[PDB]
A = this chain, B = another copy of it.
Amino acid sequence: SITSDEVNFLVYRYLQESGFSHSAFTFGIESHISQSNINGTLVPPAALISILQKGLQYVEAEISIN
């Protein structure tokens, strides 16, 4: 909540999923991903795109009560 290694994965995903095969490959290595201790079978599809969408709304909502 939320550490270095992870925002990596969250993104490494984004690349795999969005079809950025190369960028996936390269970032996979540069990120030292296969040493990165997260469980990938236990994090959602399009996990990056979403968590973002919401942080925006969290902003949007902080504007409007104020």
Q: Which of A's residues lie within 8 Å of B, judged by CB? A: 1-2, 4, 7, 10-11, 14-15, 18, 20-23, 25-27, 29-31, 48-59, 61
Contacts and interface: CB of A to CB of B under 8 A. Distances in A.
- Please give the count of copies of this chain that the complex contains: 4
Contact of A7 (B22, B49, B58): B49
Given A7-B48, A52-B51, A57-B58, A25 B22 contact: yes
A27 B31 contact: no
Nearest to A54: B55
A46 to B, nearest CB: 10
18 contacts: A2-B56, A4-B18, A7-B14, A7-B48, A11-B15, A20-B30, A22-B26, A22-B29, A22-B30, A23-B26, A23-B27, A26-B27, A29-B29, A51-B55, A54-B54, A54-B59, A58-B58, A58-B61
